[PDB]
Enzyme design. Structure first.
Site, PDB file in Angstrom:
ATOM      1  N   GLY A  52       2.297   5.902  10.232  1.00 17.08           N
ATOM      2  CA  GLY A  52       3.707   5.775   9.880  1.00 17.08           C
ATOM      3  C   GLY A  52       4.367   4.514  10.406  1.00 17.08           C
ATOM      4  O   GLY A  52       5.520   4.228  10.067  1.00 17.08           O
ATOM      5  N   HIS A 108       0.803  -1.226   0.000  1.00 22.04           N
ATOM      6  CA  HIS A 108       0.000   0.000   0.000  1.00 22.04           C
ATOM      7  C   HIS A 108       0.848   1.293   0.000  1.00 22.04           C
ATOM      8  O   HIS A 108       0.272   2.375  -0.100  1.00 22.04           O
ATOM      9  CB  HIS A 108      -1.076   0.029   1.099  1.00 22.04           C
ATOM     10  CG  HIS A 108      -0.556   0.178   2.499  1.00 22.04           C
ATOM     11  ND1 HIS A 108      -0.045   1.379   2.959  1.00 22.04           N
ATOM     12  CD2 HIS A 108      -0.561  -0.714   3.515  1.00 22.04           C
ATOM     13  CE1 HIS A 108       0.276   1.171   4.231  1.00 22.04           C
ATOM     14  NE2 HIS A 108      -0.021  -0.074   4.611  1.00 22.04           N
ATOM     15  N   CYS A 114       3.437   1.498   9.617  1.00 19.40           N
ATOM     16  CA  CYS A 114       3.319   0.440   8.617  1.00 19.40           C
ATOM     17  C   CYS A 114       4.671  -0.034   8.173  1.00 19.40           C
ATOM     18  O   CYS A 114       5.589   0.771   8.035  1.00 19.40           O
ATOM     19  CB  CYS A 114       2.472   0.899   7.437  1.00 19.40           C
ATOM     20  SG  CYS A 114       0.829   1.489   7.900  1.00 19.40           S
TER      21      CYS A 114
HETATM   22  O1  LIG Z   1      -3.775   1.805   8.748  1.00 16.12           O
HETATM   23  C1  LIG Z   1      -2.969   2.676   8.416  1.00 16.12           C
HETATM   24  N1  LIG Z   1      -2.277   3.407   9.310  1.00 16.12           N
HETATM   25  C2  LIG Z   1      -1.922   3.102  10.631  1.00 16.12           C
HETATM   26  C3  LIG Z   1      -1.494   1.860  11.097  1.00 16.12           C
HETATM   27  N2  LIG Z   1      -1.400   1.498  12.382  1.00 16.12           N
HETATM   28  C4  LIG Z   1      -1.782   2.379  13.289  1.00 16.12           C
HETATM   29  C5  LIG Z   1      -2.295   3.661  12.985  1.00 16.12           C
HETATM   30  C6  LIG Z   1      -2.873   4.510  13.958  1.00 16.12           C
HETATM   31  C7  LIG Z   1      -3.507   5.661  13.594  1.00 16.12           C
HETATM   32  C8  LIG Z   1      -3.574   5.993  12.264  1.00 16.12           C
HETATM   33  F1  LIG Z   1      -4.305   7.082  11.911  1.00 16.12           F
HETATM   34  C9  LIG Z   1      -3.005   5.258  11.279  1.00 16.12           C
HETATM   35  C10 LIG Z   1      -2.353   4.044  11.617  1.00 16.12           C
HETATM   36  C11 LIG Z   1      -2.790   3.109   6.959  1.00 16.12           C
HETATM   37  C12 LIG Z   1      -3.157   4.598   6.735  1.00 16.12           C
HETATM   38  C13 LIG Z   1      -4.608   4.841   7.114  1.00 16.12           C
HETATM   39  N3  LIG Z   1      -5.488   3.908   6.413  1.00 16.12           N
HETATM   40  C14 LIG Z   1      -5.058   2.688   5.923  1.00 16.12           C
HETATM   41  C15 LIG Z   1      -5.945   1.889   5.203  1.00 16.12           C
HETATM   42  C16 LIG Z   1      -5.518   0.683   4.680  1.00 16.12           C
HETATM   43 CL1  LIG Z   1      -6.641  -0.275   3.770  1.00 16.12          CL
HETATM   44  C17 LIG Z   1      -4.204   0.267   4.863  1.00 16.12           C
HETATM   45 CL2  LIG Z   1      -3.662  -1.275   4.284  1.00 16.12          CL
HETATM   46  C18 LIG Z   1      -3.320   1.059   5.570  1.00 16.12           C
HETATM   47  C19 LIG Z   1      -3.732   2.266   6.126  1.00 16.12           C
END
Ligand SMILES: O=C(Nc1cncc2ccc(F)cc12)[C@@H]1CCNc2cc(Cl)c(Cl)cc21
Ligand SMILES: [Cl-]
Lengths: 297, 302
Positions: B143, B41, B145
């Site tokens: 961030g 992603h 990820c």
């Molecule tokens: O999950 C994500 N971000 C974050 C990850 N771990 C804690 C996080 C905590 C807060 C935060 F706002 C982002 C955090 C990213 C960017 C937001 N959306 C998103 C959607 C999908 Cl489908 C995928 Cl695969 C990745 C993301």
């Protein structure tokens, strides 16, 4: 989201762990520059015991390489073994003595090899509720500030209650302990109040608000309640330190104190806060800010 | 003595963390030999997160679109490929700090250490478990990820998790290092929810054996149970069924403490019925399920 008991990345400390053997005793040493620091009990009249030792009696092993000891001296309860080779992996470091309530990461080691890392706090009774087995002596506690490792603890012994006692890196014990086989006991412990409040702010930041209430309290009334429940007194310094968390969440420190008072007198009532049924006191206000903002090292 | 939630020393993994930037997105990558692994992603423009066609998005990218930074050194991307939900960026330098490693896919209930990272820099290490609903209860911000989960049994790092996203309940979803998600999750912003989570029964039993090894016996009782009766009671408290494999796995701890698995299962049933009554077990007022039988033996014996 999420709130975990998080330790500092241990890499800078792992590159410092060595095995120290003297006679039948094997324990861990901290190799920084050309000196290996370890508990003086590896060798009691420690001046008399040490004078009988020669450099070649101390076998120091860094991985699969034997270091040569070229000198030895004692500083309080720590033995300093001068070696011929400076540790090329020596990080930027400081020796710091911490206060009760302060947290640090422990790199538990056996035979100079790191086995685990965990986060703990210096209890108000100066012990640490660690996880150590025989051979863990010499394992160290540390914090990281930017790129600098602040060494604050060296493990020396386990008390009869299963709790642990050790020294700063200058060999001064935390607590009224001695490195001698004699009757020693951890004093009555208390809860680190400022840390519980910081953890309640972490719960609020994570969406856990059930314990909040409309009430406030005076610092004196809070301390009268806190003394009844074996909680450490909360000082104006603690209130000031909690200021940033108070501003971020909109809950004044004395407002969070009224919540803590209600939790102490009434309990959690089957509920949890951050997945815990007990009030957690091993996160400082700095740990909460660091984790709920993502500071890196 | 003592029982702590203990993570593996993170040094071998810290020397693998790099920052990966593609367009406006910056996340973490795992640099092993001459390959940087990261969530695919990273190629997404947020406006294409609902239904991204990763094959279509990746074909439009060139090597120089991926900026990889290892410390204060920029690595040169010389190739790219996608394997499931992971992007593999071939670089022109092999990581001199590459440890002995393996990619392992874990099962629910297994534990691992997480090295939480931001901008390719490690910020903390914690321990966690793959929940039965395939999520992890991590501590991650934007961030994070690309941060990885691992075990370090002996001198080999077994990478088992790469962080991809946070679900609406605050829990986390990710993949193994081959890019296969744990659970029914997809790297799309489509409505996804973690299934009802359950307690890892075999881990709770292992933790009760850890308490017994540490001198605590207050919760033991004179009863035993059949495995079926235990499971009938367990299911009512949202505990995972205990299998014969779990009973077998608990054998060494049963032999060391002298408490048969079904005898410990009877203490657990009673704990579920009565609660703790103001008491604690290993400093906890809740039954802990993020220590495997393997973790208990390692921490209590060596
Ligand atoms: O999950 C994500 N971000 C974050 C990850 N771990 C804690 C996080 C905590 C807060 C935060 F706002 C982002 C955090 C990213 C960017 C937001 N959306 C998103 C959607 C999908 Cl489908 C995928 Cl695969 C990745 C993301
Ligand atoms: Cl597994």
């Amino acid at each position: 989201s999420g709130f975990r008991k998080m330790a500092f990345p241990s890499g800078k400390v792992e590159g410092c762990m060595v095995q120290v053997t003297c006679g039948t005793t094997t324990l861990n040493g901290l190799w920084l520059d050309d000196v290996v620091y370890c508990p003086r009990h590896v060798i009691p009249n420690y001046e008399d015991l040490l004078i009988r030792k020669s450099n070649h009696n101390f076998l120091v092993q860094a991985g699969n390489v034997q270091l040569r000891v070229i000198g030895h001296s004692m500083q309080n309860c720590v033995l300093k073994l001068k070696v011929d080779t400076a540790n090329p992996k020596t990080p930027k470091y400081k020796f710091v003595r911490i206060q009760p309530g302060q947290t640090f990461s422990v790199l538990a080691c056996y035979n100079g090899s790191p086995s685990g890392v965990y986060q703990c706090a210096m209890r108000p009774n100066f012990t640490i509720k660690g996880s150590f087995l025989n051979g863990s002596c010499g394992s160290v506690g540390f914090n990281i500030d930017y790129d600098c490792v602040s060494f604050c603890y060296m493990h020396h012994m386990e008390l009869p209650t299963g709790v642990h006692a050790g020294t700063d890196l200058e060999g001064n014990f935390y607590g009224p302990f001695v490195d001698r086989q004699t009757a020693q006991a951890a004093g009555t412990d208390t809860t680190i109040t400022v840390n519980v409040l910081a953890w309640l702010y972490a719960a609020v930041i994570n969406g856990d608000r059930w314990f909040l209430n409309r009430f406030t309290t005076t610092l004196n009334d809070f301390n009268l309640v806190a003394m009844k429940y074996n909680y450490e007194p909360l000082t104006q310094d603690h209130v000031d330190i909690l200021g940033p968390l108070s501003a971020q969440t909109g809950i004044a420190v004395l407002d969070m104190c009224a919540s803590l008072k209600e939790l102490l007198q009434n309990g959690m009532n089957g509920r949890t806060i951050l997945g815990s049924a007990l009030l957690e006191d091993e996160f400082t206000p700095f740990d909460v800010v660091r984790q709920c903002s993502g500071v890196t090292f």
